[PDB]
Design a binder for these strands. Structure first.
Ligand code: MG
Ligand code: MG
Ligand code: MG
Ligand code: MG
Ligand code: MG
Ligand code: MG
Ligand code: MG
Ligand code: MG
Ligand code: MG
Ligand code: MG
Ligand code: MG
Ligand code: MG
Ligand code: MG
Ligand code: MG
Ligand code: MG
Ligand code: MG
Ligand code: MG
Ligand code: MG
Ligand code: MG
Ligand code: MG
Ligand code: MG
Ligand code: MG
Ligand code: MG
Ligand code: MG
Ligand code: MG
Ligand code: MG
Ligand code: MG
Ligand code: MG
Ligand code: MG
Ligand code: MG
Ligand code: MG
Ligand code: MG
Ligand code: MG
Ligand code: MG
Ligand code: MG
Ligand code: MG
Ligand code: MG
Ligand code: MG
Ligand code: MG
Ligand code: MG
Ligand code: MG
Ligand code: MG
Ligand code: MG
Ligand code: MG
Ligand code: MG
Ligand code: MG
Ligand code: MG
Ligand code: MG
Ligand code: MG
Ligand code: MG
Ligand code: MG
Ligand code: MG
Ligand code: MG
Ligand code: MG
Ligand code: MG
Ligand code: MG
Ligand code: MG
Ligand code: MG
Ligand code: MG
Ligand code: MG
Ligand code: MG
Ligand code: MG
Ligand code: MG
Ligand code: MG
Ligand code: MG
Ligand code: MG
Ligand code: MG
Ligand code: MG
Ligand code: MG
Ligand code: MG
Ligand code: MG
Ligand code: MG
Ligand code: MG
Ligand code: MG
Ligand code: MG
Ligand code: MG
Ligand code: MG
Ligand code: MG
Ligand code: MG
Ligand code: MG
Ligand code: MG
Ligand code: MG
Ligand code: MG
Ligand code: MG
Ligand code: MG
Ligand code: MG
Ligand code: MG
Ligand code: MG
Ligand code: MG
Ligand code: MG
Ligand code: MG
Ligand code: MG
Ligand code: MG
Ligand code: MG
Ligand code: MG
Ligand code: MG
Ligand code: MG
Ligand code: MG
Ligand code: MG
Ligand code: MG
Ligand code: MG
Ligand code: MG
Ligand code: MG
Ligand code: MG
Ligand code: MG
Ligand code: MG
Ligand code: MG
Ligand code: MG
Ligand code: MG
Ligand code: MG
Ligand code: MG
Ligand code: MG
Ligand code: MG
Ligand code: MG
Ligand code: MG
Ligand code: MG
Ligand code: MG
Ligand code: MG
Ligand code: MG
Ligand code: MG
Ligand code: MG
Ligand code: MG
Ligand code: MG
Ligand code: MG
Ligand code: MG
Ligand code: MG
Ligand code: MG
Ligand code: MG
Ligand code: MG
Ligand code: MG
Ligand code: MG
Ligand code: MG
Ligand code: MG
Ligand code: MG
Ligand code: MG
Ligand code: MG
Ligand code: MG
Ligand code: MG
Ligand code: MG
Ligand code: MG
Ligand code: MG
Ligand code: MG
Ligand code: MG
Ligand code: MG
Ligand code: MG
Ligand code: MG
Ligand code: MG
Ligand code: MG
Ligand code: MG
Ligand code: MG
Ligand code: MG
Ligand code: MG
Ligand code: MG
Ligand code: MG
Ligand code: MG
Ligand code: MG
Ligand code: MG
Ligand code: MG
Ligand code: MG
Ligand code: MG
Ligand code: MG
Ligand code: MG
Ligand code: MG
Ligand code: MG
Ligand code: MG
Ligand code: MG
Ligand code: MG
Ligand code: MG
Ligand code: MG
Ligand code: MG
Ligand code: MG
Ligand code: MG
Ligand code: MG
Ligand code: MG
Ligand code: MG
Ligand code: MG
Ligand code: MG
Ligand code: MG
Ligand code: MG
Ligand code: MG
Ligand code: MG
Ligand code: MG
Ligand code: MG
Ligand code: MG
Ligand code: MG
Ligand code: MG
Ligand code: MG
Ligand code: MG
Ligand code: MG
Ligand code: MG
Ligand code: MG
Ligand code: MG
Ligand code: MG
Ligand code: MG
Ligand code: MG
Ligand code: MG
Ligand code: MG
Ligand code: MG
Ligand code: MG
Ligand code: MG
Ligand code: MG
Ligand code: MG
Ligand code: MG
Ligand code: MG
Ligand code: MG
Ligand code: MG
Ligand code: MG
Ligand code: MG
Ligand code: MG
Ligand code: MG
Ligand code: MG
Ligand code: MG
Ligand code: MG
Ligand code: MG
Ligand code: MG
Ligand code: MG
Ligand code: MG
Ligand code: MG
Ligand code: MG
Ligand code: MG
Ligand code: MG
Ligand code: MG
Ligand code: MG
Ligand code: MG
Ligand code: ZN
Lengths: 149, 49, 107, 64, 14
RNA sequence: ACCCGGUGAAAUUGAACUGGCCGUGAAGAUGCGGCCUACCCGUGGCAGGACGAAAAGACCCCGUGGAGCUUUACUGCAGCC
RNA sequence: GGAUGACCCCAGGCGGUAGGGGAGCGUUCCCGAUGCCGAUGAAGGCCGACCCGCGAGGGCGGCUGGAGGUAAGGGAAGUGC
RNA sequence: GCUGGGGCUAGGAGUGAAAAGCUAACCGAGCCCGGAGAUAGCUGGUUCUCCCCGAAAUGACUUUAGGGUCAGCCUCAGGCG
RNA sequence: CUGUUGGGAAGCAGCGCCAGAGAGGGUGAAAGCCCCGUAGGCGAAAGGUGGGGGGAUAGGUGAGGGUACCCGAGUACCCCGUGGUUCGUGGAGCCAUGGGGGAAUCUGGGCGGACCACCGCCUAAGGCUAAGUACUCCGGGUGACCGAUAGCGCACCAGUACCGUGAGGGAAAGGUGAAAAGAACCCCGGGAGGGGAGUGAAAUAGAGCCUGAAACCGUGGGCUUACAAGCAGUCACGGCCCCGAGGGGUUGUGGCGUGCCUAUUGAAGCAUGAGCCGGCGACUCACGGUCGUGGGCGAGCUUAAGCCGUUGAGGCGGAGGCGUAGGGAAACCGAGUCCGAACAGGGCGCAGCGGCCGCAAAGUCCGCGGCCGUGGACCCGAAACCGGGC
RNA sequence: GGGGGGAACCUGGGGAACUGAAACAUCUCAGUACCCAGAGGAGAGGAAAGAGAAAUCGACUCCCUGAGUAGCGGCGAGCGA
C-alpha cells in the first residue's frame, strides 16, 4: 500500500451543501430559504424549541412539581448505586466497591448496593447495602454477603 | 535507535530516517521498503501490544 | 555586515559561464554593493557617446561590462588551475585565502 | 459555548427511560370547589405529551 | 463625495 | 438664439432596426392582433406621448420602528417639605 | 440475460415555481513530488468549421507569450456573479 | 443705531425683542471618534452543470393579522407488504 | 570537469565526486559538487543579563513548673442604608461598609447559611513575599496565510496628498532588459513626435517599457442595405464572397416570435433594478446539540490539562465524561417502583444469529454530512440611543 | 526623591446605552464600552479569625475537570458558583 492507494470508504467523506451558487445547482438565488419571512432573514427566528408566536408556550402552561431546591443548594447525602448480581458473573473470590469501580460498573463517590436481577454465585460480596432479593439469592447460592458501613 | 547510523543515512534522497519511538504509518506507507534494528523491532512489538 | 567577495581586485580569474566562458583575465574592478566584477577584456559592449568634449566626432566606445561575481573563479598562482577558495590560518593568527586543488596561496 | 439547560423545563418535566416526556396534568391549581371528584382525581395523575411537543422540550434538556 | 445637493421638494399631492 | 473659426460639459441611458387607428393586454401599447400609412439621413423650431428626468411618496396605511411635545397615564429622579 | 456495474435485451417513467434528494465540472491550496512536464517553449493571452462529454467542461492544433507548471489517487477551502 | 479689535457662555447644554430661531452652507436636540458588525418580524441581493421527485397560499392559537408554533400538504432514509 | 543545442546551461550526453551538508535562495533557462548558504563546529576587549554553580552576610532554632502582664479599637458586635457572591428580600448566612450605638485579651474572639444547643474549624482590626499567569511596541523562526481591487490604511518618501475651524477623516501609485548595451550619427519638425542608423535572443521589451483581456475609438477588405413595420432572433430557400456530394461568412424573400432580473393572483409590460466592460462582492467558523453515515472497540468506550519525545515522529497521562436500572416531590425501595388500606386497577419501567468459538450488537470514541442552539451567524442598509472628546 | 511617556497586558476609583426580554419598568446587555489614578516587565493575589463534614484539607496564582452541576431568576428572557 503506497500513498496514492490510501482512500476513504465510499460514503465516508461526503461533499458539502453549497447554496447560492447558480441556477443549475437547484440551491441558488434564495439559498433554499424561500421568500421574504423572518426565517429568511440573517438571524432568523426565535428559538423554535420554545417560541410559539407570542402565545403562552406549551411548556410554560404546565405545572411545576417537587422540591426544586433553595440556597445554599444540594444537601450532602450518602449516595447509593445499584449493581445487579448478573454483573458480578465475571469475578471470583472477593468483590468490593473499589474493585467494581475498576471494572467500570460503580461510578466513584457512590455507596454500593447489590441488586436482584441475575444469578448469585458463591462469592464474598462486600457492599453498603443489599436488596431483599439479592440477599435471598446470595445466601441461597453459598455466597457470603458482608455488609460494610 | 543508533545515533551514528541515522547520521550516515540522513542525506540520502531515498532514505527517510527515523528512531523507533517515532515509527508512524504515514512514513511507513510513503516509503517502499522498511528496515529496522532487532532493537527497534522489539520496541515496535511493545507499542502494538 | 559586508557583501562577501571570493574574488578581489587584481587577481587572475577564469570566467566560467556566459558568452565568455573559458576566458581568463585580471579582475580590473570589484563592485561589492552590486555583486559583480569587471574582468580585463571580457564582456565588451558598444556604448553610444555624444559629440562633446573628450568625445568629439562622437560615435561609439567599447567598455567592459560587469559580470555577475559568481561567474568568475580565481586561478591558483601555483598549480595554475581554477579553484574554489579555502581559508588557512597562518601562525601570525592572520588568515589568507588558499587554493583548493593544491594548497597554494592566493593572498 | 456549550448549551445551557432550560430550568423551567427541568422544573416541570421528566424524560422517561425510553425517552417519553411526562408532565403533570393542568387545571387543578385552584377553582376546585365545583369540580368533580373524578376531575380532581384524574388531574392528579401524570401524563405523556404529544410527540411534537415532547421532542421540542427534550431539546431543552441536553444533559439529562 | 464632497457636498450633497439637497433635492427639490415634491409637488404636494395631498 | 442662428452661421463660420477656437475650447468643449451635463443629468440620463436594459438593448433598439423606436409610426397611425380600432382592439387586445396587470384595466391608458413604438414592441400583441387586424387594418392604414410610410424612400435613406439631417438642420432650425414646438412641447401632445415616451404612464418623460430628478427625489427607494412628504399624504395615507403597516412596523408590538424612532424622535419632540403634554398631562389629574405608569414608574422613577433632582429639588423642596 | 451474466453472475452481485462487465455489458446485452425487454418493458415503463422522465413539464415544472417554493423546496427535498442524487451525481458531476471547474477554482486556490496540501500530500503524491529530492519526482514528472518545461526555452525543441511554463503559466496567461488570441483563434479553430477538429476530437471527447448530456452538460459544467476536457483535449488537440496554430498564433501570441517568455518561466514556470504539475498526473493517477486523495486531502482542505477566502471556490464559480 | 451700525461697525473693527480683544474676550465669555454649548449639546438636554448655551443664546434667543420667541421664529422651536441660532450654536461653522440641512438643528424639535451640533460635530467627531467610540460602544458597533446596535437593532431592522422590512426592501434588495445571493454566483457551476446535469438527473429524480415535487408543494402551499388551509385549520387552531398568537398585542396576531405581510411574523410565528403545531397540524395539513413536498422530499429523503430505514421498516412493513 | 568535458562535449552539445542555445544570446545564456544549471537542460541533454559521457565519465566522476561529497554528504553529520540532497533546508533554501542565487548565477543568462532547470546546479548537492560556481556563488550565498546548510549539517556540524568556533567566537567578545566592552556593555547588558545571570532564575544555574560557589562563597558571604542578615537571619534562625530547648524543656518543665509558676504567673495571668501582652496578643493590632471608634475595631469586633448589634441595628439602619448598600455592595460582593450562584443568591433579584429570600428562611439570607458569609465578606465589605456610609450612619447610630459600642466591648473584651484566650474563661478573649470570628466561622461551619436565620436562630439555639451540642460537636468542631479558625485566631480579625500592621506590613512583605519569588515561581507557575497575562500582553506583544520590539527580535527571530515557521505557514495545505495574501500576492498589488489581495495582504496592514501604506510593497512606492503614508498617517502623506487631499478634506475638515477643530477633534477627526484619509487615498491612489509596484514589474524595461541577462546586461543600459537607455538608441552616437543623419532626415522632417519650433518642440513634441516620428523615419533611418545602431544595441539586444527579442524593440507592437524604447523607458507613456513583462504579459497586454474587455468595454470603447479607428483604418482597410468581403457580403449587404435608400417602398421599408423592428425584443432584432430562429427556421427555410435562394444570391454573392471564401475554404477546399461538404463547410465558413453575408442576408434577399417567406414562416414564426411580448428583453433580463425582481416582485406578484397576474408583467413585454406604461411596476423594480441595470449605460457598457473588467476586477471586489453574500450561508462561515468555534463550542454545544440532534439525526445520519465511514471506521475502531464493545459491558464497556474514551481521555482533559499536562509530561516525555520529535523538530511537519509519536507516545505517556484514567483526573474526569458517557453507558451498564428504573420508579418516586422526597425519605426511600429496586426489576421493579409510584398512587392506594389493597393480594385491586393503572402510570412509568424490566427480556441476537449460525456453528464453547464465528458473525453481530447495547454503548462509546473519532472522521464526514444535514439540521438546531449560542455568538454579527447569508451580505449590504436605517431613523435612533449611549459614552468620552472637538 | 517625585513630575512625563509607553502597542497591548494589570490592579484600583468611577461607570453607560443600543440590545435581549419578539412591547417594558425589575432583569439583560455588563461592572462591558469608556473616563480617571497607579504599577511594572508583568500586575493582582498570598502564608488561614480559610474551607466545610471528610472524626478531613493545609498560602496564593494559573490550566484541566467538577458543571451548564448546585443554585439564582417579572422561576420569564436568561444568569451561573
Ligand atoms: Mg452532495
Ligand atoms: Mg470535507
Ligand atoms: Mg461546489
Ligand atoms: Mg446553481
Ligand atoms: Mg428548486
Ligand atoms: Mg432571502
Ligand atoms: Mg433553510
Ligand atoms: Mg426570501
Ligand atoms: Mg413564501
Ligand atoms: Mg413572495
Ligand atoms: Mg428576494
Ligand atoms: Mg409572503
Ligand atoms: Mg418563510
Ligand atoms: Mg418554520
Ligand atoms: Mg444584521
Ligand atoms: Mg432578527
Ligand atoms: Mg409552580
Ligand atoms: Mg434537584
Ligand atoms: Mg535529508
Ligand atoms: Mg532523506
Ligand atoms: Mg523519499
Ligand atoms: Mg586581524
Ligand atoms: Mg423555572
Ligand atoms: Mg419531575
Ligand atoms: Mg395546589
Ligand atoms: Mg356542576
Ligand atoms: Mg364527583
Ligand atoms: Mg387523590
Ligand atoms: Mg454530566
Ligand atoms: Mg454656412
Ligand atoms: Mg462652434
Ligand atoms: Mg482648453
Ligand atoms: Mg457624464
Ligand atoms: Mg437588443
Ligand atoms: Mg436593434
Ligand atoms: Mg425604421
Ligand atoms: Mg377590455
Ligand atoms: Mg378593462
Ligand atoms: Mg390601446
Ligand atoms: Mg407600430
Ligand atoms: Mg415585443
Ligand atoms: Mg416584434
Ligand atoms: Mg403573439
Ligand atoms: Mg401594432
Ligand atoms: Mg400588425
Ligand atoms: Mg393610417
Ligand atoms: Mg430635431
Ligand atoms: Mg413632448
Ligand atoms: Mg423648450
Ligand atoms: Mg408628457
Ligand atoms: Mg409630461
Ligand atoms: Mg416621472
Ligand atoms: Mg424614472
Ligand atoms: Mg432606503
Ligand atoms: Mg417608500
Ligand atoms: Mg423620499
Ligand atoms: Mg393608505
Ligand atoms: Mg406612520
Ligand atoms: Mg402595541
Ligand atoms: Mg405585531
Ligand atoms: Mg414603539
Ligand atoms: Mg419617544
Ligand atoms: Mg433623545
Ligand atoms: Mg422650589
Ligand atoms: Mg426509454
Ligand atoms: Mg423514475
Ligand atoms: Mg411525459
Ligand atoms: Mg423534471
Ligand atoms: Mg472537483
Ligand atoms: Mg494522502
Ligand atoms: Mg515537494
Ligand atoms: Mg525533459
Ligand atoms: Mg532558446
Ligand atoms: Mg513558440
Ligand atoms: Mg493553471
Ligand atoms: Mg496558478
Ligand atoms: Mg478549449
Ligand atoms: Mg499557450
Ligand atoms: Mg524558478
Ligand atoms: Mg497538485
Ligand atoms: Mg487529483
Ligand atoms: Mg467569498
Ligand atoms: Mg462696540
Ligand atoms: Mg464689535
Ligand atoms: Mg475676536
Ligand atoms: Mg453668556
Ligand atoms: Mg459656550
Ligand atoms: Mg466653557
Ligand atoms: Mg465642549
Ligand atoms: Mg444633544
Ligand atoms: Mg438625547
Ligand atoms: Mg436647554
Ligand atoms: Mg435680537
Ligand atoms: Mg462643521
Ligand atoms: Mg447651520
Ligand atoms: Mg442628526
Ligand atoms: Mg433627539
Ligand atoms: Mg451646524
Ligand atoms: Mg474616542
Ligand atoms: Mg454591543
Ligand atoms: Mg452586528
Ligand atoms: Mg428596536
Ligand atoms: Mg423597522
Ligand atoms: Mg412529475
Ligand atoms: Mg395576549
Ligand atoms: Mg395590525
Ligand atoms: Mg409583521
Ligand atoms: Mg411545519
Ligand atoms: Mg400523504
Ligand atoms: Mg554556441
Ligand atoms: Mg557545462
Ligand atoms: Mg549528466
Ligand atoms: Mg538538512
Ligand atoms: Mg531546492
Ligand atoms: Mg527565482
Ligand atoms: Mg531538474
Ligand atoms: Mg523548477
Ligand atoms: Mg542551487
Ligand atoms: Mg535550488
Ligand atoms: Mg549549529
Ligand atoms: Mg552554523
Ligand atoms: Mg490578662
Ligand atoms: Mg490577633
Ligand atoms: Mg455576624
Ligand atoms: Mg448590613
Ligand atoms: Mg446584588
Ligand atoms: Mg444582598
Ligand atoms: Mg425580581
Ligand atoms: Mg425568594
Ligand atoms: Mg445574601
Ligand atoms: Mg459600618
Ligand atoms: Mg474560647
Ligand atoms: Mg466569647
Ligand atoms: Mg465576622
Ligand atoms: Mg453564626
Ligand atoms: Mg466555617
Ligand atoms: Mg474555619
Ligand atoms: Mg497577619
Ligand atoms: Mg507582589
Ligand atoms: Mg510577581
Ligand atoms: Mg506571579
Ligand atoms: Mg514579530
Ligand atoms: Mg496564491
Ligand atoms: Mg507564490
Ligand atoms: Mg496597483
Ligand atoms: Mg493596496
Ligand atoms: Mg496586476
Ligand atoms: Mg482580485
Ligand atoms: Mg488579489
Ligand atoms: Mg508597514
Ligand atoms: Mg488601501
Ligand atoms: Mg495631512
Ligand atoms: Mg504624495
Ligand atoms: Mg481646509
Ligand atoms: Mg488644514
Ligand atoms: Mg495604496
Ligand atoms: Mg526588471
Ligand atoms: Mg529592472
Ligand atoms: Mg535571460
Ligand atoms: Mg539598472
Ligand atoms: Mg533643422
Ligand atoms: Mg528626437
Ligand atoms: Mg517621422
Ligand atoms: Mg527615433
Ligand atoms: Mg532563442
Ligand atoms: Mg508582442
Ligand atoms: Mg515583450
Ligand atoms: Mg520578465
Ligand atoms: Mg505593452
Ligand atoms: Mg498599449
Ligand atoms: Mg468599416
Ligand atoms: Mg407602395
Ligand atoms: Mg429596394
Ligand atoms: Mg420553405
Ligand atoms: Mg453555402
Ligand atoms: Mg445561407
Ligand atoms: Mg423573417
Ligand atoms: Mg438572465
Ligand atoms: Mg414589490
Ligand atoms: Mg405589488
Ligand atoms: Mg416593451
Ligand atoms: Mg418600456
Ligand atoms: Mg413607479
Ligand atoms: Mg421596465
Ligand atoms: Mg416595490
Ligand atoms: Mg430589483
Ligand atoms: Mg434608472
Ligand atoms: Mg458598452
Ligand atoms: Mg461585472
Ligand atoms: Mg449552512
Ligand atoms: Mg453533527
Ligand atoms: Mg458520528
Ligand atoms: Mg477504538
Ligand atoms: Mg482508552
Ligand atoms: Mg401512602
Ligand atoms: Mg404495576
Ligand atoms: Mg404495564
Ligand atoms: Mg464490531
Ligand atoms: Mg459503532
Ligand atoms: Mg434540526
Ligand atoms: Mg457576535
Ligand atoms: Mg455572520
Ligand atoms: Mg447559521
Ligand atoms: Mg434616549
Ligand atoms: Mg435610554
Ligand atoms: Mg455625547
Ligand atoms: Mg461630555
Ligand atoms: Mg509613569
Ligand atoms: Mg476599570
Ligand atoms: Mg452617568
Ligand atoms: Mg435598558
Ligand atoms: Mg445589540
Ligand atoms: Mg430600552
Ligand atoms: Mg426588546
Ligand atoms: Mg423585540
Ligand atoms: Mg418601542
Ligand atoms: Mg451587572
Ligand atoms: Mg472595578
Ligand atoms: Mg503613569
Ligand atoms: Mg515573567
Ligand atoms: Mg500585595
Ligand atoms: Mg500571619
Ligand atoms: Mg440573568
Ligand atoms: Mg451578571
Ligand atoms: Zn593550486
Amino acid at each position: 500500500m503506497k500513498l496514492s492507494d490510501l482512500r476513504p470508504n465510499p460514503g465516508a467523506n461526503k461533499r458539502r451543501k453549497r447554496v447560492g451558487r447558480g441556477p443549475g445547482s437547484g440551491h441558488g438565488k434564495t439559498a433554499t430559504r424561500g421568500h421574504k419571512g423572518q426565517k429568511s432573514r440573517s438571524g432568523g427566528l426565535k428559538d423554535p424549541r420554545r417560541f410559539e408566536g407570542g402565545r403562552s408556550t406549551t411548556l410554560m402552561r404546565l405545572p411545576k412539581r417537587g422540591m426544586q431546591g433553595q440556597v445554599p443548594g444540594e444537601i450532602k447525602r450518602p449516595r447509593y448505586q445499584g449493581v445487579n448480581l448478573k454483573d458480578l458473573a465475571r469475578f471470583e473470590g472477593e468483590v468490593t466497591p473499589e474493585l467494581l469501580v475498576r471494572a467500570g460498573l460503580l461510578k466513584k463517590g457512590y455507596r454500593l448496593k447489590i441488586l436482584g436481577e441475575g444469578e448469585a454465585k458463591p462469592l464474598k460480596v462486600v457492599a453498603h447495602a443489599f436488596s431483599k432479593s439479592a440477599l435471598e439469592k446470595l445466601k441461597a447460592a453459598g455466597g457470603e454477603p458482608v455488609l460494610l458501613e | 535507535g543508533n545515533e551514528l547510523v541515522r547520521r550516515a543515512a540522513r542525506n540520502l534522497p531515498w532514505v527517510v530516517t527515523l528512531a523507533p519511538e517515532g515509527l508512524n504509518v504515514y512514513d511507513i506507507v510513503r516509503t517502499e521498503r522498511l528496515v529496522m534494528d532487532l532493537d527497534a523491532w522489539e520496541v515496535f512489538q511493545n507499542r502494538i501490544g | 555586515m559586508r557583501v562577501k567577495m571570493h574574488v578581489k581586485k587584481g587577481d587572475t580569474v577564469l570566467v566560467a559561464s556566459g558568452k565568455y566562458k573559458g576566458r581568463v583575465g585580471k579582475v580590473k574592478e570589484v563592485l561589492p554593493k552590486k555583486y559583480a566584477v569587471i574582468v580585463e577584456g571580457v564582456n565588451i559592449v558598444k556604448k553610444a557617446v555624444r559629440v562633446s568634449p573628450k568625445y568629439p566626432q562622437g560615435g561609439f566606445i567599447e567598455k567592459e561590462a560587469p559580470l555577475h561575481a559568481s561567474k568568475v573563479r580565481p586561478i591558483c598562482p601555483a598549480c595554475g588551475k581554477p579553484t574554489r577558495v579555502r581559508k588557512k590560518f597562518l601562525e601570525n593568527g592572520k588568515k589568507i585565502r588558499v587554493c583548493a586543488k593544491c594548497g597554494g596561496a592566493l593572498d | 459555548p456549550k448549551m445551557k439547560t432550560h430550568k423551567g423545563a427541568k422544573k416541570r418535566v421528566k424524560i422517561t427511560a425510553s425517552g417519553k416526556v411526562v408532565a403533570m396534568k393542568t387545571g387543578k391549581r385552584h377553582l376546585n370547589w365545583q369540580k368533580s371528584g373524578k376531575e380532581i382525581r384524574q388531574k392528579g395523575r401524570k401524563f405523556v405529551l404529544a410527540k411534537p411537543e415532547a421532542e421540542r422540550i427534550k431539546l431543552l434538556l441536553p444533559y439529562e | 463625495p464632497t457636498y450633497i445637493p439637497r433635492p427639490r421638494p415634491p409637488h404636494p399631492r395631498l
